[PDB]
Design an enzyme around this catalytic site. Structure first.
Site, mmCIF file in Angstrom:
data_model
loop_
_atom_site.group_PDB
_atom_site.id
_atom_site.type_symbol
_atom_site.label_atom_id
_atom_site.label_comp_id
_atom_site.label_asym_id
_atom_site.label_seq_id
_atom_site.Cartn_x
_atom_site.Cartn_y
_atom_site.Cartn_z
ATOM 1 N N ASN A 44 0.823 -1.170 0.000
ATOM 2 C CA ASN A 44 0.000 0.000 0.000
ATOM 3 C C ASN A 44 0.905 1.287 0.000
ATOM 4 O O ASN A 44 1.956 1.386 0.678
ATOM 5 C CB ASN A 44 -0.861 -0.039 1.279
ATOM 6 C CG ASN A 44 -1.942 1.052 1.410
ATOM 7 O OD1 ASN A 44 -2.237 1.408 2.591
ATOM 8 N ND2 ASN A 44 -2.623 1.543 0.339
ATOM 9 N N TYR A 77 -8.148 13.735 -2.217
ATOM 10 C CA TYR A 77 -7.829 12.979 -1.050
ATOM 11 C C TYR A 77 -7.265 13.933 -0.001
ATOM 12 O O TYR A 77 -6.462 14.796 -0.329
ATOM 13 C CB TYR A 77 -6.810 11.897 -1.354
ATOM 14 C CG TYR A 77 -6.198 11.238 -0.195
ATOM 15 C CD1 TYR A 77 -6.912 10.394 0.624
ATOM 16 C CD2 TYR A 77 -4.905 11.558 0.161
ATOM 17 C CE1 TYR A 77 -6.323 9.798 1.752
ATOM 18 C CE2 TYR A 77 -4.320 11.001 1.312
ATOM 19 C CZ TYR A 77 -5.011 10.105 2.082
ATOM 20 O OH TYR A 77 -4.548 9.516 3.280
ATOM 21 N N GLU A 86 -10.432 11.351 7.309
ATOM 22 C CA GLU A 86 -9.684 11.128 6.032
ATOM 23 C C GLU A 86 -10.776 11.027 4.953
ATOM 24 O O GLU A 86 -11.745 10.242 5.138
ATOM 25 C CB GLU A 86 -8.963 9.804 6.150
ATOM 26 C CG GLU A 86 -8.041 9.460 4.944
ATOM 27 C CD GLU A 86 -7.374 8.098 5.040
ATOM 28 O OE1 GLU A 86 -7.971 7.233 5.669
ATOM 29 O OE2 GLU A 86 -6.189 8.016 4.635
ATOM 30 N N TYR A 88 -12.215 11.045 0.602
ATOM 31 C CA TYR A 88 -11.863 10.690 -0.752
ATOM 32 C C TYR A 88 -13.019 11.118 -1.633
ATOM 33 O O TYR A 88 -14.123 10.854 -1.257
ATOM 34 C CB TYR A 88 -11.800 9.218 -0.855
ATOM 35 C CG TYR A 88 -10.640 8.466 -0.205
ATOM 36 C CD1 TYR A 88 -10.608 8.218 1.115
ATOM 37 C CD2 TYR A 88 -9.600 7.970 -1.025
ATOM 38 C CE1 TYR A 88 -9.553 7.417 1.650
ATOM 39 C CE2 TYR A 88 -8.573 7.200 -0.510
ATOM 40 C CZ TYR A 88 -8.541 6.940 0.783
ATOM 41 O OH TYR A 88 -7.482 6.108 1.209
ATOM 42 N N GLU A 177 -3.385 6.057 -5.186
ATOM 43 C CA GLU A 177 -3.209 5.086 -4.128
ATOM 44 C C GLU A 177 -3.179 3.676 -4.770
ATOM 45 O O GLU A 177 -3.937 3.418 -5.736
ATOM 46 C CB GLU A 177 -4.408 5.169 -3.156
ATOM 47 C CG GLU A 177 -4.354 4.105 -2.042
ATOM 48 C CD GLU A 177 -5.094 4.428 -0.784
ATOM 49 O OE1 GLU A 177 -5.668 5.514 -0.667
ATOM 50 O OE2 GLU A 177 -5.044 3.565 0.127
#
Ligand code: PDC
Ligand code: PDC
Ligand code: PDC
Ligand code: EU
Ligand code: EU
Ligand code: EU
Length: 190
Positions: A44, A77, A86, A88, A177
């Site tokens: 990741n 993001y 967080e 998106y 990502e």
């Protein structure tokens, strides 16, 4: 240039590149608001360019190429504090819809597509303030694209109508990502 993970400014834009330690990711800052990422058998990672801090009414433009081979997102993001969130606004993705298994709360129309809205929870996870439990907010675009303009207020307003509130903004980028995949991308932000 090809850089190792970190954050900073490049050509007028904030950048962030984080990699979980699995290697296989080549992140490069380019001229202006451009960055590229080429990855092979990654873990990741998250990388891209924008602003520190973002705003609650920025109109973000992106363009270029996005060619994931597996689990990957292309998103506006960012984060807030107080509350710690967080978020998106997912413009394109690979083989894994990030909302898989999440409970849908609603829909918003913006910049030419319907988006589906979701809330998820990260428990004892890394964050802008260190290990934390926090919510994630999602808008997932139905009509996948790799260039366009995002009216972030449309999303922040719809999220608020679902009780999903944002704090004081932290950074706000257009990010590629990946999660245990391969791909290429070359994206210019403005
Ligand atoms: O020597 C290294 O491990 C290295 C060099 C440039 C980039 C990266 C990276 O993105 O991990 N890693
Ligand atoms: O400085 C580095 O090379 C570095 C730092 C974090 C992760 C990675 C990686 O996954 O190779 N590499
Ligand atoms: O220790 C490292 O960061 C490392 C080791 C092998 C490959 C890579 C890489 O792809 O960055 N990084
Ligand atoms: Eu490395
Ligand atoms: Eu219609
Ligand atoms: Eu960390």
């Amino acid at each position: 240039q090809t850089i190792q993970p970190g954050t900073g400014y490049n050509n007028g834009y904030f950048y962030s590149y984080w990699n979980d330690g699995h290697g296989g990711v080549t992140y490069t800052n380019g001229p202006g608001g451009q960055f590229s990422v080429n990855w092979s058998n990654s873990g990741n990672f998250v990388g891209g360019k924008g602003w520190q801090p973002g705003t609650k009414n920025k109109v973000i433009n992106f363009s270029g190429s996005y060619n994931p081979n597996g689990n990957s997102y292309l998103s506006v993001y960012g984060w807030s504090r107080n509350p710690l969130i967080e978020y998106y606004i997912v413009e394109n993705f690979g083989t894994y819809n990030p909302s898989t298994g999440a409970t849908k709360l609603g829909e918003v129309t913006s910049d030419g597509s319907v988006y589906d809205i979701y809330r998820t929870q990260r428990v004892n996870q890394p964050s802008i303030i260190g290990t934390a439990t926090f919510y994630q907010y999602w808008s997932v675009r139905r009509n996948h694209r790799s260039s366009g303009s995002v009216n972030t207020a449309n999303h922040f307003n719809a999220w608020a109508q679902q009780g999903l509130t944002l704090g004081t903004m932290d950074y706000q980028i257009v990010a590629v990502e990946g999660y245990f995949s391969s791909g290429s991308a070359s994206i210019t932000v403005s």
